Amino acid sequence: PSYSPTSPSYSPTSPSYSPTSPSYS
């Protein structure tokens, strides 16, 4: 079968690096 599933390695603490710039109208 499946020997072992993968442990949840989520990193919500990661801040992300989305560039924000086209806000001014």
Partner 1 sequence: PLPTRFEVELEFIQSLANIQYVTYLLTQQQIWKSPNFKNYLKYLEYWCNPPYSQCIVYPNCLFILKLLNGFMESALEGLDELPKIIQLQGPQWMNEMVERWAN
Partner 2 sequence: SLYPPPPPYVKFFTQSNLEKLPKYKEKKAASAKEEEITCALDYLIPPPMPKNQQYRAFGSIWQENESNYQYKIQELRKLLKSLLLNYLELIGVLSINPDMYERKVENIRTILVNIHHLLNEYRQSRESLIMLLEEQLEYKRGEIREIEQVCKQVHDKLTSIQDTLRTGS
Using CB under 8 A, list all residues that contact partner 2. 20-21, 23-24
Q: How many residues bind partner 1 (CB under 8 A)?
A: 6
Distance CA 15, CA 22 (A): 20
Contact pick of 9, 13, 23, 25 for partner 1 (by CB under 8 A): 13
Q: Least distance from C-beta 19 to partner 1, angstroms?
A: 10
Query: Distance between the two ends of the chain, CA-based, in angstroms?
Result: 57
Q: Least distance from C-beta 12 to partner 2, angstroms?
A: 23
